[PDB]
Design a protein around this nucleic acid. Structure first.
Ligand SMILES: [Mg+2]
Ligand SMILES: [Zn+2]
Lengths: 52, 468, 225, 104, 136
RNA sequence: UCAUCUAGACAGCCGGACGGUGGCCAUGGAAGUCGGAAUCCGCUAAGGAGUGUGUAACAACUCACCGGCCGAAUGAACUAG
RNA sequence: GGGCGUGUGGCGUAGUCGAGCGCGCUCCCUUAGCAUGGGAGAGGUCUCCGGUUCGAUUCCGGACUCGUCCGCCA
């Protein structure tokens, strides 16, 4: 156990992201398009897979 | 950092050994420190030491103990670190640690607690009731290495005052008894040691070592406190009634007779106190078990069990006196067991064995336990013959033979019969004549000062010169 | 105690260490836990010497030790011999042995009073053992095992021998050594008991994989309680 | 209400990260001590599946072991049992229609 | 060597390539060992994997007892007979190639070793040093 | 091509987001939110017989709607260089 | 290598979405031989595992699998 607030603060940077389906890039959670050129700024995004 | 609540313990409302609001118990499953208390510890370093102590591997535990000791050594810097919360947690862990298989863990834990008492004197008063019984149990542990240092440290802690050490026995006697009860009655071999990591044996071995320490403590408590029997009778009865103390009286299996010896001492002490006479059931249970032990001694284990045999016989003689040999009456086959025991015992003689045998005879003669002529003499004669064939072989030989003669001579005196007199003379001559080098060992000759009138011995010397 | 120790992963402590009543010898290339076991258990009363014998980390199989004397092979250098002479107390005698078998811990199984040797040792080496160690010597094999030092662990109180040993050989060796002997295993069933562990009057050190019945057999036969 | 307390008690031990075997030994010890919660719990626990079996008196007499998921609320666990009943009833109704034709 | 190594080993001049037959020094009933592989050997085109003293090899019993023949087992080289240099600069060699049988962890299948063994092997394998008569 | 727009639009904060009514069937329960149908009034500046989270069912939170600040364009879908 | 088919009792072998026979032998009875017959026996995870079904050899998917067939150059 870390602490509940400290787990929230660490998960803000480590777990509450989104993943581009084409190029696996770690993206902002409210993003609409990937920031990478190689996937062509696609809008195929998924949430980052949580535990539990 | 630490999570979870001991909800079950709250329902239980039993503090076990602890009187400070924390359950303290020897068994692994319960009495573990509460997580909230662990969070409350003053420093991160303390928390880490505790986590390591909880972990099963010994090397990790030893390192943690070493770290804790280092922190205590620098007390002035770390006085802030040690707080009631630390003491409550330590008390719960210390109990588990003292039962540890590894000696180093046991020794270090004892040293650490003593240091805490010296350094935090007068602030550990609340916790003295929890700590003192455990410290004492360590000082009364069969292994010399754990016990001697621990006692020396304790004496030093109390400024080398004998009175203080004795006072401790008196002040916490009720608590000391509670610890004994917990080991003897509350615990079982399984509870003390995890089954997965231990065999059926070993688990038994461990329990027995711990229980032996409890008995040694009980004997010490009785000696130190004269009025213990009256004040704590109910508690004493429950500890005594349980068969666990008595199960220790088995010589068929087991590494040492030291534990068995401790039980014998307890029975003797109880008889001297009169508790055994006072409570018949406890006495009968003890006596029957002792008789069973006599059967256990066998030719295969005679060498191993030989030191304990003089002691066993001596206790029996004392018990026989009670109730006019009432002890033999309890068991229908007791006489047979004794006869068998004697036959096995005679083959291997240990120092002091003969004196015990005579003592038994002295108690038994008034009530005619053994026929003097049909039964006893054969035992004596065979014994001398055996002694002669393989006498010098051993060292104690001179002492052992001396003993036989002194004892046999007394036995012979109460005969008023020709056969006994004849046997004495013939055996004496044989013992001296085949001999070995009886004259040469001056001590042996001195110890065996004489067996007959002076002039006759001279006549026999005369025959040897006169012989072909 | 039979103390659980490893030599960097090795569960054979008799190979890398030699323990007597008066001194202890440990290899120079050892871990902190391995040194800390001997330092904590032995205490400050008994010197512990970090030594190398003949340029080798193995010292227990190279040397045969006693409270009165220490025997070293011919290949031991003058620097190692002088370091042992300075570090050891004045009571013990250190003498080089000039003998073909040259691995004295494997060759010789010895205690304070009586010793068992390899049958084929030279007579000068036997007299050298009897002189320096002050110990009476028998040439005997343990059920056909010529390496009595590797296949027996011996102390004053008792002895542990090879597990596959004839019972007649057990009472013969027990009567010859005047100590009780038990056939048993060490380090989760390893046959080499003398290489497996070291023992003296009050301490035994064994590998971590030595199981609890084996450790109980050790403390029972060596009377360490 | 009693069931919820039982669930909380088991959970606290799990949170500590205590060995599952040790936890069970503890339950047994508590039963000897007469802890009420301890008495309710059956000795074998399917911790791997997070299921605890708790004996419940038929009438506030005989106690029937009931599987409870630690994660779900006590009420929720009960609904799952109710759901099984509902599914069984639906199956039975379909079977009734099937039987007449099947027999022919 | 590899897994069961107790420490490292300085480079000894390689004397036993693949296909070499060495004497079987222990009392396991095997007479010779035939080397088919060397543990830890590198890869080069046309180069035979060669063994030195103290190395662990894979070997078959070509001559010996039938329950030891016709299978592969690990072995440890204890006598080399090709001269090699130590860091004190003596060039030394035995008069025959010899090895013992072991498991992959390194403990000996046999119980006693006949003849000398090298100290570079005895330091690296403790069971070999345990059952070894003379270490040079 | 649809919509909104100085009579205050879209983002961002803040407040309300209600009664008839736990609308009718159906379920051991399901009260806006397991489903089937209907989907209407009042008070309104405004609030769906409910957008989700949500409980055994509740309770609770949030929505799309209206309001203060902002003062001017903005939202959705689609087409092709 | 690939493709394709296959699989039932201790053995063999018949099977509609509703596991049978024969044999080895379990027992009992039988007979002028150059010795048999009769009557009751046991025995399946239908290769295996899922889904479907109302249940599945029987329906379907996966795996196993044994048998088949086809595959280089100068
Ligand atoms: Mg090539
Ligand atoms: Zn992308």
């Amino acid at each position: 156990i870390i602490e509940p607030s400290l787990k929230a603060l660490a998960s803000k940077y480590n777990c509450d992201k989104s993943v581009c389906r084409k190029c696996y890039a770690r993206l902002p959670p409210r993003a609409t398009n990937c920031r990478k050129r190689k996937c062509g700024h696609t809008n195929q995004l998924r949430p980052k897979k949580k535990l539990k | 950092s630490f999570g979870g609540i001991n909800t079950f313990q709250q329902y239980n409302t039993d503090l076990g050994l602890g009187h400070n609001g924390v359950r303290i118990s020897l068994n692994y499953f319960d009495g573990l420190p509460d997580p909230s208390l662990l969070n409350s510890l003053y420093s991160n370093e303390l928390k880490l030491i505790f986590k390591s102590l909880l972990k099963r591997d010994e090397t990790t535990k030893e390192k943690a103990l070493m770290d804790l000791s280092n922190l205590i050594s620098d007390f002035n810097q770390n006085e802030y670190f040690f707080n009631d919360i630390f003491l409550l947690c330590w008390s719960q862990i210390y109990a588990k640690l003292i039962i540890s298989d590894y000696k180093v863990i046991r020794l270090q834990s004892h040293q650490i607690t003593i240091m805490l008492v010296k350094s935090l004197r007068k602030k550990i008063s609340k916790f003295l009731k929890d700590f003192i019984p455990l410290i004492l149990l360590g000082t009364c542990e069969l292994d010399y290495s754990v016990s001697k240092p621990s006692l020396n440290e304790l004496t030093e802690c109390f400024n080398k005052d004998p009175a203080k050490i004795n006072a401790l026995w008196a002040v916490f006697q009720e608590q000391l008894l509670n610890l004994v009860k917990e080991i003897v009655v509350n615990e079982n071999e399984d509870t003390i040691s995890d089954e997965r990591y231990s065999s059926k044996e070993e688990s038994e071995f461990r329990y027995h070592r711990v229980i032996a320490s409890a008995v040694l403590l009980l004997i010490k408590l009785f000696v130190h406190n004269k009025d213990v029997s009256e004040r704590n009778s109910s508690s004493l009865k429950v500890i005594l009634s349980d068969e666990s103390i008595w199960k220790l009286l088995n010589l068929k299996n087991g590494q040492n007779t030291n534990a068995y010896e401790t039980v014998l001492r307890l029975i003797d002490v109880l008889y001297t106190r009169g508790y055994m006479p006072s409570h018949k059931n406890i006495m009968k249970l003890a006596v029957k078990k002792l008789l069973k032990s006599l059967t256990h001694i066998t030719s295969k284990n005679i060498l191993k069990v030989c030191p304990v045999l003089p002691s066993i016989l001596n206790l029996l003689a004392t018990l026989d006196d009670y109730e006019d040999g009432t002890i033999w009456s309890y068991d229908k086959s007791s006489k047979e067991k004794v006869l068998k025991f004697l036959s096995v015992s005679r083959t291997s003689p240990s120092p002091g064995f003969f004196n015990a045998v005579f003592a038994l005879y002295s108690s038994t003669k008034r009530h005619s336990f053994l026929d003097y002529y049909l039964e006893w003499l054969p035992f004596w004669q065979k014994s001398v013959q055996r002694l002669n064939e393989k006498g010098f072989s051993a060292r104690n030989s001179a002492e052992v033979l001396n003993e036989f003669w002194t004892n046999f001579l007394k036995f012979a005196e109460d005969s008023s019969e020709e056969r006994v007199k004849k046997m004495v003379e013939s055996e004496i001559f044989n013992s001296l004549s085949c001999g070995k080098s009886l004259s040469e060992y001056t001590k042996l000759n001195q110890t065996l000062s004489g067996v007959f009138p002076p002039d006759k011995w001279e006549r026999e010397i005369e025959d040897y010169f006169t012989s072909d | 105690m039979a103390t659980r120790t490893q030599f960097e992963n090795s569960n054979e402590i008799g190979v890398f260490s030699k323990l007597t009543n008066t001194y202890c010898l440990v290899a120079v290339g050892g871990s902190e836990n391995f040194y800390s076991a001997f330092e904590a258990e032995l205490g400050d009363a008994i010197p512990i010497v970090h030594t190398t014998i003949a340029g080798t980390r193995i010292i227990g199989r190279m040397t045969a030790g006693n409270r009165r004397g220490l025997l070293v092979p011919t290949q031991t250098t003058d620097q190692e011999l002088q370091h042992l002479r300075n570090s050891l107390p004045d009571s013990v005698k250190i003498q080089r042995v000039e003998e073909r078998l040259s691995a004295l811990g494997n060759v010789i199984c010895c205690n304070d009073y009586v010793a068992l040797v390899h049958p084929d040792i030279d007579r000068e080496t036997e007299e050298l053992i009897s002189d320096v160690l002050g110990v009476e010597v028998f040439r005997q094999t343990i059920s056909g095992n010529i390496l009595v030092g590797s296949y027996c662990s011996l102390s004053n109180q008792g002895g542990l021998v090879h597990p596959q040993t004839s019972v007649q050989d057990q009472e013969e060796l027990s009567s010859l050594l005047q100590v009780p002997l038990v056939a048993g295993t060490v380090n989760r069933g390893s046959s080499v008991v003398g290489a497996g562990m070291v023992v003296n009057d009050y301490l035994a050190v064994t590998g971590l994989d030595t199981t609890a019945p084996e450790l109980s057999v050790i403390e029972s036969i060596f009377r360490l309680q | 209400p009693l069931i919820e307390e039982v669930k909380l008690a088991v959970q606290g031990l799990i949170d500590q990260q205590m060995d599952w075997n040790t936890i069970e030994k503890l339950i047994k010890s508590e039963q000897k001590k007469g802890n009420r919660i301890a008495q309710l719990l059956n000795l074998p626990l399917n911790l791997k599946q997070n299921k605890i079996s708790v004996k419940l008196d038929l009438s506030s007499n005989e106690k029937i072991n009931v599987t409870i998921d630690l994660g779900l609320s006590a009420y929720a666990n009960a609904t799952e049992y109710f759901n099984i009943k509902k599914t069984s009833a639906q199956k039975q109704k379909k079977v009734e229609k099937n039987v007449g034709k099947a027999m022919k | 060597s590899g897994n069961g190594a107790q420490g490292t080993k300085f480079r000894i001049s390689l004397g036993l390539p693949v296909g070499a037959i060495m004497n079987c020094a222990d009392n396991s009933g095997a007479r010779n060992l035939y080397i088919i592989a060397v543990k830890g050997s590198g890869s080069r085109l046309n180069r035979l994997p060669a063994a030195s003293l103290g190395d662990m090899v894979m070997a078959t019993v070509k001559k010996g007892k039938p329950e030891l023949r016709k299978k592969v087992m690990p072995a440890i080289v204890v006598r080399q007979a090709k001269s090699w240099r130590r860091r004190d600069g003596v060039f030394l060699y035995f008069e025959d190639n010899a090895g013992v049988i072991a498991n992959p962890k390194g403990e000996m299948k046999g119980s006693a070793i006949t003849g000398p063994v090298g100290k570079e092997c005895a330091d690296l394998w403790p069971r070999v040093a345990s059952n070894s008569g003379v270490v040079v």
